Amino acid sequence: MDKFRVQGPTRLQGEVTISGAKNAALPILFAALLAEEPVEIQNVPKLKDIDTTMKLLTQLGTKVERXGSVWIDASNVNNFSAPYDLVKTMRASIWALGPLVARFGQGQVSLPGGCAIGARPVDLHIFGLEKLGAEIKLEEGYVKASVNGRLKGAHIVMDKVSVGATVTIMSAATLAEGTTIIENAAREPEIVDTANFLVALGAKISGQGTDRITIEGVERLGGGVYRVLPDRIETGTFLVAAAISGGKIVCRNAQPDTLDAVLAKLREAGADIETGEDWISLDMHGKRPKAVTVRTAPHPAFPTDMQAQFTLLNLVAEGTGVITETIFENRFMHVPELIRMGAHAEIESNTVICHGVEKLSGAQVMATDLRASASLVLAGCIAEGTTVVDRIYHIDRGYERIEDKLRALGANIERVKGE
Numbered sequence: 001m002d003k004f005r006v007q008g009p010t011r012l013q014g015e016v017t018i019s020g021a022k023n024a025a026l027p028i029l030f031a032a033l034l035a036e037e038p039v040e041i042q043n044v045p046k047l048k049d050i051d052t053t054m055k056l057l058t059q060l061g062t063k064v065e066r067x068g069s070v071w072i073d074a075s076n077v078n079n080f081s082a083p084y085d086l087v088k089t090m091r092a093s094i095w096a097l098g099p100l101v102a103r104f105g106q107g108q109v110s111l112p113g114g115c116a117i118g119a120r121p122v123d124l125h126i127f128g129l130e131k132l133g134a135e136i137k138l139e140e141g142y143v144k145a146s147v148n149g150r151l152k153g154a155h156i157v158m159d160k161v162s163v164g165a166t167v168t169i170m171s172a173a174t175l176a177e178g179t180t181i182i183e184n185a186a187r188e189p190e191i192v193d194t195a196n197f198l199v200a201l202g203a204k205i206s207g208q209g210t211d212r213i214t215i216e217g218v219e220r221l222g223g224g225v226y227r228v229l230p231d232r233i234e235t236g237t238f239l240v241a242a243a244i245s246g247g248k249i250v251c252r253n254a255q256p257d258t259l260d261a262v263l264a265k266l267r268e269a270g271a272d273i274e275t276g277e278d279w280i281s282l283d284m285h286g287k288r289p290k291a292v293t294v295r296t297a298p299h300p301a302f303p304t305d306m307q308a309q310f311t312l313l314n315l316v317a318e319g320t321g322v323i324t325e326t327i328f329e330n331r332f333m334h335v336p337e338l339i340r341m342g343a344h345a346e347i348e349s350n351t352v353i354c355h356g357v358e359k360l361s362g363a364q365v366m367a368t369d370l371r372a373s374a375s376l377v378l379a380g381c382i383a384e385g386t387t388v389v390d391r392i393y394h395i396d397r398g399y400e401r402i403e404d405k406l407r408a409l410g411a412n413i414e415r416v417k418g419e
């Protein structure tokens with residue numbers, strides 16, 4: 001079982017090329033199920049989640065190929081069920097439900113059980129589909145959606161702001177009969193890209209990025225070539241990494257207007273931030289970060305995907321910092337791990353109180369979150385001594401060659417094959 005052997009402290013410095021967003025390519029790939037023609041998706045990150053989604057697509061009859069881009073061919077989808085064995089490793093699998101029923105009149109997807117980050121029902125998805133005409137049922141764990149002919153456009157208002165359910169409703173609405181309006185929709189950059197992608201295929205969508213997305217059903221979807229946006233999370237992760245190490249870094253292949261909250265939080269912390277059309281520079285000028293307060297929430301607010309990272313930041317910052325989760329009240333696994341490393345923190349419900357310390361100690365930790373767990377690696381880079389990160393399989397899910405990227409920064413990280 002893979003593991004990380006990290007040794008610090010280390011002052012991160014240098015250059016890094018941000019990969020395509022993981023959370024953009026996922027819904028985009030699932031969206032390709034609709035495409036009736038070959039599709040070329042560019043800038044796809046090399047990561048576990050992508051492997052999983054590619055494999056899933058294959059199970060449906062989709063022709064798949066890959067390098068920097070992914071070659072998708074759905075012309076011959078012959079299967080409509082996403083197997084329990086696969087969904088149980090990636091809840092995102094549910095993304096195949098809407099496209100499948102929207103285009104085929106049918107589709108089945110193992111109903112996702114629990115997740116370590118906490119409660120994550122998919123109620124909004126089904127609900128969203130029913131409103132479109134989908135006749136949905138639950139057989140032996142499988143979500144069975146079925147529609148007689150095309151789906152009908154409807155006026156849907158969302159109980160919660162949900163990236164997942166917005167993509168489900170949006171995507172399926174492209175092939176529906178009539179007009180669909182998603183009120184109280186997610187405004188995540190990844191939603192905008194999934195829509196842009198869809199539009200490129202010949203779909204009719206407006207309002208992407210706003211709280212009101214409008215979809216105009218069409219006959220069918222062609223093929224084409226789309227370019228996935230840069231991963232905002234990766235970037236924020238790299239930025240934080242430099243910011244907690246007194247680093248001086250540059251971000252290539254970026255999109256600054258997706259980090260406003262992170263960017264501002266960083267400046268607040270005390271870093272020197274400059275940005276360009278597709279780049280972002282950060283220089284700590286040899287300074288220890290200043291504690292900051294964070295409140296996760298739907299974009300464009302602070303993203304929970306950066307939450308753990310910022311928690312780390314506060315752990316070694318001067319002052320009392322506060323992190324409050326409003327998206328995943330249980331996304332704290334990292335804390336007890338970082339505390340093993342000499343960190344001081346208190347947990348009160350969805351909030352963690354931070355007490356910065358002068359140093360961190362190398363020790364044995366355990367990853368458990370495909371994104372929060374990165375904080376663990378970041379921790380080992382600035383901590384004193386050797387940190388062994390267990391279960392890095394998590395990180396390989398949301399990070400393309402993370403050790404390589406870190407290494408190009410001066411990090412003393414090594415991958416270990418034998419448990």
Ligand SMILES: C=C(O[C@H]1[C@@H](O)[C@@H](CO)O[C@H](OP(=O)(O)OP(=O)(O)OC[C@H]2O[C@@H](n3ccc(=O)[nH]c3=O)[C@H](O)[C@@H]2O)[C@@H]1NC(C)=O)C(=O)O
Pocket residue numbers: 023026092119120121122123124125160161162163164165304305327328370371398
């Ligand atoms: C971890 C990762 O990233 C996830 C987080 O970044 C999250 C940010 O919210 O959004 C997406 O998951 P999500 O599941 O789609 O995100 P919500 O629907 O927005 O969930 C936000 C809140 O909404 C509740 N909710 C959601 C749907 C529903 O039907 N019912 C319902 O109650 C939910 O349980 C939360 O309490 C991301 N995953 C992907 C694959 O894109 C990762 O990289 O894998």
Ligand SMILES: CC(=O)N[C@H]1[C@@H](OP(=O)(O)OP(=O)(O)OC[C@H]2O[C@@H](n3ccc(=O)[nH]c3=O)[C@H](O)[C@@H]2O)O[C@H](CO)[C@H](O)[C@@H]1O
Pocket residue numbers: 088089090112113114115116368393
């Ligand atoms: C061998 C090992 O040590 N870990 C494996 C396990 O990682 P993990 O053990 O990290 O977990 P997982 O993703 O299977 O489960 C994460 C958490 O969710 C819970 N959960 C998960 C799925 C579900 O349908 N219901 C549910 O309740 C589970 O009890 C655990 O607390 O699985 C992965 C695929 O998923 C890989 O095979 C990992 O190598």
Ligand SMILES: [Mg+2]
Pocket residue numbers: 088089090115116
């Ligand atoms: Mg899991």
